[PDB]
Design a protein around this ligand. Structure first.
Ligand SMILES: Nc1c([N+](=O)[O-])[nH]c(=O)[nH]c1=O
Ligand SMILES: Nc1c([N+](=O)[O-])[nH]c(=O)[nH]c1=O
Ligand SMILES: Nc1c([N+](=O)[O-])[nH]c(=O)[nH]c1=O
Ligand SMILES: Nc1c([N+](=O)[O-])[nH]c(=O)[nH]c1=O
Lengths: 294, 295, 295, 295
């Protein structure tokens, strides 16, 4: 037997950084959860119990705080690159650093129509994330994403014309409720190293803010033929909106709302065009993914 | 041995209701989870295994669906009152109905700067809840609440002057991060029945909006001397603002962010005035609560 | 406006304690999550913002560890009493102490049929808990419980004879799956103080073992007319076996498993007597509660 | 732009199957959660909004139910094999079926030491799972696994000899607590089809039992030099006991238990050799993985 692959690191490293402005005095908060996983010539730590090759996971935790203190934590794509670069460079047996970051929302409150200097709110469980893979002599592979963005449309969604057979009981429909938790991932074209990345910094927040706007918009305006049809259109606009991005991935759970036939009760009309009260279903759920390249 | 207390019903009934405007075409969604426990002359289903006094939890479910269909579902205070009342009246062996509604946010999307007709977003895990207790001959007791409201302030919070002894190790501070999850409940004056409740409908949505606002506002403005202090303030304004509330209750789990001393690394300064990077703590957590009533 | 009530303390305090036997060499681990909520003359911390009367929540955290260090942490009923007692005795303005304890399972592994000396496994998400209320001159109130004990029986459960009306669609059944999460609580007779508690220490683990025992058996053996009937039975046995317990509370979720009519597909028989494959429902769920006391 | 990848299906499909033995009487439950994503000539549904290619996820759900009702459901590798197969065959345009199955523990209850015929307990949150990719013309690929296995050992674990530098502050140790959640996956060599799988059936349940046993025992015995070192040993014995296993993957979150210095209080000694009370840490946590194939 033999170590085909190995990675080890620290997970769930929760970090919080505050930016205090002098003139304005206005503070900015950033909170994230980090996980670094290392790779390289370390087999011996598994095979023969050699801890000499092991950089302690506590050390990595130490490193993460240290870095966040010396560098800017935003945007996640940068910070994750600065982070993952360090590891491969400060150590010789360390060839690949895998950085996952999850940004949490700390929106600035508006008290009395005016933005507040130092009071924030978790205005959603939606996260902004980066998977940054830093390889020695292969540059930095970034994958940005947005997740947990939960949406719902009360109509203007349809589902018919699907294959029918001896396992089909679903009835075609022209007016259904459409709900999902959006998971969108846009991969960036390989970066030489940190230098290329810093050069594109502004492109990151803009591409995330774009992907978000497209998703929302396209969700709401598309007279959905299917979830499939709606993702591709979503993808499309993103690609077309950014040359750097190489691909776009969407994984969407089709969260079902079922009509309730109340007709057994005083001939109550609650189906079809009379549908008012539905039963959201926790499960099962539809899952539909798809990667969109050029 | 004897049945000292009993209640049964149905929990986690997910309900979704759509309202369509024929004119504008603007649809409006509502989603809640409902729990109805019923109390009554039911000892016999426990002691003699007598199911004839039982109204199947299934039927309670159906009832919830029908009631949502034939009635307005907002404000939750109203719906809950209609729903609980039905059971005490429909059934003679049932004398109390306990109703719990958790309202889920489905805020309308803002596409291109314009409120979309039929598109919403879950803009927060925050919830609006109501606990309606309906007792035959004792009116309707309503507690209204907001929960899941997570806040954080990077400064303007202190904690010094607390009792020190041989169990203390907590260094006083004049500046600290203050984050918490807000659980605030306001309890309305007992209501005689559905009628008096309908009489005050507009008040509910308003009082809730007030309570929220009063909570963010105070939290953000107050130069906190202690979570206990900031809290009381919030309660105060709430009572002063609504005559109908008999009591306000706040439950605050203060979530700690610890500074990380990095002096051991190239003398890096990261505490006190030079504190930038902190480490949020999942546990433990302080837990402060209090009930403010009227004089 | 006035502070009708206030409590505060520390929540979610994880504690782990090991017991190393010199002779045997065998080790015994204990893990739990603790919460202490304090009460007393502490309004001025809310009203006048006076941190003088505030024992810092952090100091409560310290106190927990310290206490856990000088005393045994098992049984929880005792540990909780010692800890609650301390606070009321150590502080004059502190009159009531509320202590909650959730004990996690770390069951000793059996390797090769023998009980390993220092290797444990979490063999259930089942908890054993205690809510101990220590009040100045009112004694110690102890509520012992188990929770998160998930069970199922594929037959020997029925539900029929229930009330049927225009809201009823549930078909009577003489055979169904029954699955619930057991939440069971037994309230001990009040205790003067720490001494009386220490005197009954052997009764605790005993009574919890019994409660667990009686719950499992009765759930397995009973041909269930209703979940209510079965739960009342199980409370009875518990009150009989232990005189110190004044009341027993059960709260059970009736997790439904639905039949799947597959007839529409090649006349496949899956319902009634032919039922093999079912659809466990995440929700909603029946919720049946009941507190059984002494006649 | 174009469609580089696309999969679609049904997720979280709860299934429960009962087996009734007419002779003995002994009933036997199985409960699982299936997810089935399909791949094939379906690009059009995304680009040309043509649902003619789409086999409604609902039908997948129905398919799953029927399938479970017409076949045996254990061992998961068989069922998921039958199930993924069915979709490639029945549908020309579908050329890959990815089937996930999570098996839920329903362990037979022991009432008065005698195994009950129809009663069960979720004796753990441990899960047996299988991932079964079935590609048309590339046999059946089957990764087996066990997850949610939570263990802890009070001693016989050390960690010293690691690299130290200006980032290090971790003290070496010759005795520490080791606790993790074991995630162990063992891949099977590619199988030609449903007939080869069916062939080996008996291997499945047995390998799984071995993987647990190897895991359990090794963890409990190995005087651990590093998590890394103890894992590798496990992988070894697994690959050894089964020539059908192409690789073994272990994912182990190292859950930390910190010492609590209490010297500040009456010089209480709670560190090193006198460490009794510890603070379990929810986060962060070391995460150690590694795949072990053959030479
Ligand atoms: N960093 C590591 C630790 N550690 O505690 O940091 N323990 C291990 O078994 N392995 C590691 O790599
Ligand atoms: N509603 C009830 C049901 N039921 O299924 O609706 N089953 C019981 O055992 N008890 C109930 O009260
Ligand atoms: N212990 C307390 C803290 N604290 O941080 O320990 N903060 C508060 O606002 N109040 C307390 O009582
Ligand atoms: N099965 C599908 C459904 N459906 O509801 O079953 N809806 C979609 O948009 N897409 C599907 O593939």
């Amino acid at each position: 037997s033999a170590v085909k692959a190995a990675r080890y690191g620290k997970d769930n490293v929760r970090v919080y950084k505050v930016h205090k402005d002098e003139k304005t005095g206005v503070q900015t908060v950033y909170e994230m959860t980090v996980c670094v996983l290392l790779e390289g010539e370390i087999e011996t730590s598994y095979t023969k119990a050699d801890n000499s090759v092991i950089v302690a996971t506590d050390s990595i935790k130490n490193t993460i705080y240290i870095t966040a203190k010396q560098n800017p934590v935003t945007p996640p794509e940068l910070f994750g690159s600065i982070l993952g670069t360090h590891f491969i460079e400060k150590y010789n047996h360390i060839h690949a650093a895998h950085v996952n970051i999850v940004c949490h929302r700390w929106t600035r409150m508006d008290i009395d129509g005016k933005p507040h200097p130092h009071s924030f709110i978790r205005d959603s469980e939606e996260k902004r994330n980066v998977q940054v893979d830093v390889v020695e002599g292969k540059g930095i592979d970034i994958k940005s994403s947005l997740s947990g963005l939960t949406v719902l449309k009360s109509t203007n969604s349809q589902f018919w014309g699907f294959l029918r057979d001896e396992y089909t009981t679903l009835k075609e429909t022209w007016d259904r409720i459409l709900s999902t938790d959006v998971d969108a991932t846009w991969q960036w074209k390989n970066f030489s190293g940190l230098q290329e990345v810093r050069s594109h910094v502004p492109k990151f927040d803009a591409t995330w803010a774009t992907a978000r706007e497209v998703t929302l918009k396209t969700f709401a305006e598309d007279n959905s033929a299917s979830v499939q049809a709606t993702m591709y259109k979503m993808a499309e606009q993103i690609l077309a909106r950014q040359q750097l991005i190489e691909t776009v991935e969407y994984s969407l759970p089709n969260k079902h709302y079922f009509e309730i036939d109340l007709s057994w009760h005083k001939g109550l009309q609650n189906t079809g065009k009379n549908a008012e009260v539905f039963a959201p279903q926790s499960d099962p759920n539809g899952l539909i993914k798809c990667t969109v390249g050029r």
